[PDB]
Amino acid sequence: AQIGPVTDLHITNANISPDGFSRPAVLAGGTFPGPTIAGNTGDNFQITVFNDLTDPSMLTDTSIHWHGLFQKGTNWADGPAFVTQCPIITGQSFDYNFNVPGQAGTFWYHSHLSTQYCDGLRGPFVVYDPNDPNASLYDVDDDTTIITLADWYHTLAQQEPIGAAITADATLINGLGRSFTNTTASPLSVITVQSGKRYRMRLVSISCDPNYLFSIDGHDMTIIEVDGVNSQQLTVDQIQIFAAQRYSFVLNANQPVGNYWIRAQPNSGGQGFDGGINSAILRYEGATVEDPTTTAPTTFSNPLVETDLHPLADLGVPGQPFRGGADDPLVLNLAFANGRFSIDGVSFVPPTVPVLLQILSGAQNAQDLLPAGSVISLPSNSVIEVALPAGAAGGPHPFHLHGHNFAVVQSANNATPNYVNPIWRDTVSIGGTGDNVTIRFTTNNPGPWFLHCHIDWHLEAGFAIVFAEDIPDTASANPVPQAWSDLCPAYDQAHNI
Numbered sequence: 001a002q003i004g005p006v007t008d009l010h011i012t013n014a015n016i017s018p019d020g021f022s023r024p025a026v027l028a029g030g031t032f033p034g035p036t037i038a039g040n041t042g043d044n045f046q047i048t049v050f051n052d053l054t055d056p057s058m059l060t061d062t063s064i065h066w067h068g069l070f071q072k073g074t075n076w077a078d079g080p081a082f083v084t085q086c087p088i089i090t091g092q093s094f095d096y097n098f099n100v101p102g103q104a105g106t107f108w109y110h111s112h113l114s115t116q117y118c119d120g121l122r123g124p125f126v127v128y129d130p131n132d133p134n135a136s137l138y139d140v141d142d143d144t145t146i147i148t149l150a151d152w153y154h155t156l157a158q159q160e161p162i163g164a165a166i167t168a169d170a171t172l173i174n175g176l177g178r179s180f181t182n183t184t185a186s187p188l189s190v191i192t193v194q195s196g197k198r199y200r201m202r203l204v205s206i207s208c209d210p211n212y213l214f215s216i217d218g219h220d221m222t223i224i225e226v227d228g229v230n231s232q233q234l235t236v237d238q239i240q241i242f243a244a245q246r247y248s249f250v251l252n253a254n255q256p257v258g259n260y261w262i263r264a265q266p267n268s269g270g271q272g273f274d275g276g277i278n279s280a281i282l283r284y285e286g287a288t289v290e291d292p293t294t295t296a297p298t299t300f301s302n303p304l305v306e307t308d309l310h311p312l313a314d315l316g317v318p319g320q321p322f323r324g325g326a327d328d329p330l331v332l333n334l335a336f337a338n339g340r341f342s343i344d345g346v347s348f349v350p351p352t353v354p355v356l357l358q359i360l361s362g363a364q365n366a367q368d369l370l371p372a373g374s375v376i377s378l379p380s381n382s383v384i385e386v387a388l389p390a391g392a393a394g395g396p397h398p399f400h401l402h403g404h405n406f407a408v409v410q411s412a413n414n415a416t417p418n419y420v421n422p423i424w425r426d427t428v429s430i431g432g433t434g435d436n437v438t439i440r441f442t443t444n445n446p447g448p449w450f451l452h453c454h455i456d457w458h459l460e461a462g463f464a465i466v467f468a469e470d471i472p473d474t475a476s477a478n479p480v481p482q483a484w485s486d487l488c489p490a491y492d493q494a495h496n497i
């Protein structure tokens with residue numbers, strides 16, 4: 001069952017074997033993925049997170065981010081460790097108490113301390129719309145229509161050796177899948193549909209790294225939502241989904257009663273589907289309980305191309321219709337060398353005092369904020385443009401901005417900008433060498449908002465900056481509860497800082 005919008009959430013260690021190989025993990029709600037947190041648009045969420053972690057190999061501190069929720073007036077509840085809070089220490093709990101005005105769609109939650117989400121603390125987060133403009137396009141939308149895609153590692157995140165390449169050992173679809181090496185015939189996930197019905201499939205990438213080529217043999221997929229933003233209907237037969245992105249698509253159960261492969265091919269790790277890796281099963285009611293016998297095409301006829309997506313609503317684009325046509329036009333220099341990423345020449349290393357606390361204590365220019373060179377001020381009530389030219393090793397990099405969604409004025413692999421009707425989203429691939437992926441948004445949400453690559457191994461290696469939006473208004477706009485004020489003293493005492 002779904003939990004929320006008011007719930008406890010216990011964070012524990014346990015052994016799991018989602019691909020037949022047992023290892024310890026960091027879990028929310030006792031499971032991988034964690035339970036779905038849900039409510040309706042505008043609801044008050046109060047998620048009281050109980051840190052019960054005891055195994056130091058995966059860190060006993062934690063902090064949870066609610067990915068894609070704007071947190072307007074509640075920056076303290078956003079979750080990124082050392083940006084908006086100190087971590088919760090073991091044996092303690094913390095109420096993330098926030099509201100979701102003006103948002104409805106498919107989100108997720110994850111640890112936002114170090115690489116801890118890779119060790120298992122990840123789950124879906126759905127905000128339903130009782131008056132959804134897409135409601136008539138489908139019949140079923142519930143916990144059984146959520147599809148998570150996850151990378152899974154046999155080596156613990158903190159134990160990945162410095163200097164060796166990191167790749168996953170399995171793809172998990174709804175928490176199950178088979179290992180790339182030493183493959184055993186462990187159980188595959190089954191998604192069940194009834195012939196003649198239409199389903200709102202909520203596709204969530206909870207990946208720490210790979211992008212997936214997602215498809216369903218025999219079926220096509222009509223996109224209706226992108227990262228929380230309702231879209232015009234776009235029919236595709238394959239979706240390339242990057243880390244942390246979400247799509248809703250209508251699945252019409254219009255093929256013969258049977259079994260069909262669900263495919264999620266990562267860009268690294270095991271290639272293909274031998275032994276049932278990278279696979280799940282779409283089973284119609286009344287079908288034989290047996291594996292599919294379907295195949296993929298050699299070439300997909302209608303792959304998703306991001307420039308084909310358009311908002312359902314008339315969202316437009318803020319600013320003027322040319323490069324640099326914004327109040328605050330930025331171009332970030334994104335680089336990698338010698339094991340570390342940098343933005344504008346500075347590699348992100350989390351500060352001792354969280355950025356929000358530094359602001360509330362009176363640091364009021366971004367040159368005064370630590371880490372030096374990693375915090376950039378944005379002016380209030382202004383159009384911001386951020387160009388993110390690709391080329392840094394380890395791509396394609398999916399960049400994500402907290403506190404906001406944004407218009408994607410220029411997408412990967414296409415040099416033409418769109419100042420008329422591009423999709424809005426919150427995580428975007430910046431593409432390949434020579435690309436100039438560019439985003440725009442307006443600053444109506446005071447607080448420090450993280451901007452980073454959502455490949456968690458790259459974040460850890462410094463691929464991040466903080467946008468301190470409207471520093472002068474941050475304190476008045478974000479009143480903090482006593483429990484939040486208690487976090488840093490408790491953390492610093494427990495760690496002798």
Ligand SMILES: *[C@@H]1O[C@H](CO)[C@@H](O[C@@H]2O[C@H](CO)[C@@H](O)[C@H](O)[C@H]2NC(C)=O)[C@H](O)[C@H]1NC(C)=O
Binds near residue numbers: 324330331387389436
């Ligand atoms: C990506 O687009 C930005 C503008 O959004 C380009 O930025 C300009 O860069 C040149 C030097 O390369 C400067 O002289 C300009 O002041 C910048 N801003 C403008 C023209 O608006 C950037 O060059 C583009 N990058 C790539 C790799 O195409």
Ligand SMILES: *[C@@H]1O[C@H](CO)[C@@H](O[C@@H]2O[C@H](CO)[C@@H](O)[C@H](O)[C@H]2NC(C)=O)[C@H](O)[C@H]1NC(C)=O
Binds near residue numbers: 416
């Ligand atoms: C490259 O991106 C551009 C801009 O998003 C796409 O151009 C649009 O194409 C649509 C569909 O034909 C037209 O309605 C628009 O008027 C175009 N806008 C602009 C500004 O040119 C283009 O289709 C993309 N290229 C590919 C191959 O998908």
Ligand SMILES: [Cu+2]
Binds near residue numbers: 065110
């Ligand atoms: Cu996220």
Ligand SMILES: [Cu+2]
Binds near residue numbers: 066401
């Ligand atoms: Cu986020």
Ligand SMILES: [Cu+2]
Binds near residue numbers: 453454
């Ligand atoms: Cu990256």
Ligand SMILES: [Cu+2]
Binds near residue numbers: 112450
């Ligand atoms: Cu983040």
